[PDB]
Design a protein around this ligand. Structure first.
Ligand code: MWU
Length: 299
């Protein structure tokens, strides 16, 4: 194995203004102003529910380890941590929130070019995690964030593992998981391919809930019997046949992210041929030195 020469950047609490809450685990939107640099970087800041929980701190630093270890345009990178009473994670602000909330809010304005372009960008992000021997284990629309409508990134490395992997319980999302994941707590790049299939299905159904109202104890059995999620209305058989390939029992019979990139990107060249949508053709404070995390490099 190669050595992980990732830099973990420690930040002074004075270097960022929390600006607003985004969630409650609690998450703030903020500005980061690196020491005498004359730039302001919109950031997301996360800290613990209870400061002095040793179990909680092990968790967030594991998240930090992984996020420090990734540099790809379709993956969230750690900017730094702050070692206050409550440890603060600092990442790139994704202003438009999670892609699940986004498809739901904007279903009447989302066209095929966007949907297929997302499918590609997620396939690229996941393919990069695979290059880096990394297994996400919690890929879902809820865990893909929207920097712009044209640009999404994979997030929430809370469950992510460097290198099969054999786990041991914990509240885990059954409806996104490969069969071999539910049965034998096995996880691979190919089990992430399954979750990718469910993620694409989330998008193509404009955020609808998989196996809606079916309790998760049943799921194992249903999939054994041969059942899968339905063809979404907008989906040509071309797009749906791709999703179905992600839900094969033989993990190695499933497609590879590098292939999914290729297949979705061919379809993105002629989007109205692959996704049929009603009327598809139709579809900040006083801060001067602001710069997106993506243009802010340090050696
Ligand atoms: C891409 C880093 C990231 O996860 N940012 C983030 C998280 C939550 C809300 C907004 N932005």
């Amino acid at each position: 194995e190669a050595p992980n020469q990732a830099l973990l950047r420690i930040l002074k609490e004075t270097e960022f203004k929390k600006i607003k809450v985004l969630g409650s685990g609690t998450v703030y939107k903020g500005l980061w102003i690196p020491e005498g640099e004359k730039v302001k970087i919109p950031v997301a800041i996360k800290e613990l529910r209870e400061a002095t929980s040793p179990k909680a701190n092990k968790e967030i630093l594991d998240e930090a380890y992984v996020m420090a270890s990734v540099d790809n345009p379709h993956v969230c990178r750690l900017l730094g941590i702050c070692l206050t009473s409550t440890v603060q994670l600092i990442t790139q602000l994704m202003p438009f929130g999670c892609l699940l909330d986004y498809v739901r809010e904007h279903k009447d304005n989302i066209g095929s070019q966007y949907l297929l372009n997302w499918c590609v960008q997620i396939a690229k992000g996941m393919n990069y995690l695979e290059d880096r021997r990394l297994v996400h284990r919690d890929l879902a629309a809820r865990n893909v964030l929207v920097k712009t409508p044209q640009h999404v990134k994979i997030t929430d490395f809370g469950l992510a593992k460097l290198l099969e992997y054999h786990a041991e319980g914990g509240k885990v999302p059954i409806k996104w998981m490969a069969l071999e994941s539910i049965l034998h707590r096995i996880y691979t790049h190919q089990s992430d391919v399954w979750s990718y299939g469910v993620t694409v299905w989330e998008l193509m159904t404009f955020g609808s809930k998989p196996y809606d109202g079916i309790p998760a104890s049943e799921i194992s059995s249903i999939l054994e019997k041969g059942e899968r999620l339905p063809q979404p209305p907008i989906c040509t058989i071309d797009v749906y046949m791709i999703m179905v390939k992600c839900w094969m029992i033989d993990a190695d019979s499933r497609p590879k992210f590098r292939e999914l990139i290729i297949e979705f990107s061919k379809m993105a060249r002629d989007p109205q041929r692959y996704l049929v949508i009603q009327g598809d053709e139709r579809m900040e404070e006083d801060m001067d030195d602001v710069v997106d995390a993506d243009e802010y490099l340090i050696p």
